[PDB]
Symmetry: C4
Subunit: 82 residues, 4 copies
Amino acid sequence: VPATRILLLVLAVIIYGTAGFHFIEGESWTVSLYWTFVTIATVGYGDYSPHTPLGMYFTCTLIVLGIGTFAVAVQRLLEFLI
Amino acid sequence: VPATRILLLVLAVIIYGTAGFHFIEGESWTVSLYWTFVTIATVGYGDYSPHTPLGMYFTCTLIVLGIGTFAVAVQRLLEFLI
Amino acid sequence: VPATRILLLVLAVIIYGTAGFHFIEGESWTVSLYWTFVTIATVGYGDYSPHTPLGMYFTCTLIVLGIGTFAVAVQRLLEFLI
Amino acid sequence: VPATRILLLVLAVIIYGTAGFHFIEGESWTVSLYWTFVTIATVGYGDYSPHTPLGMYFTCTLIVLGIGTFAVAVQRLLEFLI
Ligand SMILES: [K+]
Ligand SMILES: [K+]
Ligand SMILES: [K+]
Ligand SMILES: [K+]
């Protein structure tokens, strides 16, 4: 898969995660973007997390759709930095 | 290993994690399912965690049985989405 | 590397992590073992963490020595379960 | 990529993470180094995390630049220990 396509896929995941957390959990756009990265990178500080059943369901979908995508994206970035 | 078999294996892990956390730690089915995903994806927010010695032992078993299974499942899902 | 040797290596990591956390941070053997798994699996709930400078240094060493070892161990366990 | 070059790359990431967290979030050099390892290893206890918008942005950059680098570094260390 071409690296630029992988870039677009991870950007789509990031938009999905950010907008979802913002609207479902009510955190700022900035906090939601931060939380999205922390989640899909699997860092998961827990400073932010879903507190609603919908937020929890949404988070599981983001986990499934985002973690693999982010992992592949970082791998490709390695090559272009190294 | 066929992707559908990997699907069944991760579903079995999810049932195991969810039922175990629910019965050992006493959280709702929904919270337990959420916690199971957060754990096997290695996100681990820490908003939920075991507070009993049995829960701690159980969590270690879920970690060992689930993390690899989930990792393989997300990899295969990548291919079917991309 | 033979799977049984990988088993011994991860067991050595587990002993190292458990004894270290117990003596440096003062948590029970059970809690320390649980924390060791949660850490080397990279789950990191944060329900337990080092609160001393020595504990922090020790945790970084466990992270470096343990995360790779655990990752290889789970991969090999996959094959023997599947 | 030569293992020594990978060593230098992860050391550069560690300096970047430590100095950044120290200056942006105001934690001690020791705490900042610890947080850097916990973050790039993806452990993310959440005992420490950014509380400013700049810190959050910085953390996302560290996540993107550091997680892959650390993953490759631990893999190479495995070979030299085993
Ligand atoms: K956490
Ligand atoms: K984590
Ligand atoms: K975590
Ligand atoms: K992780």
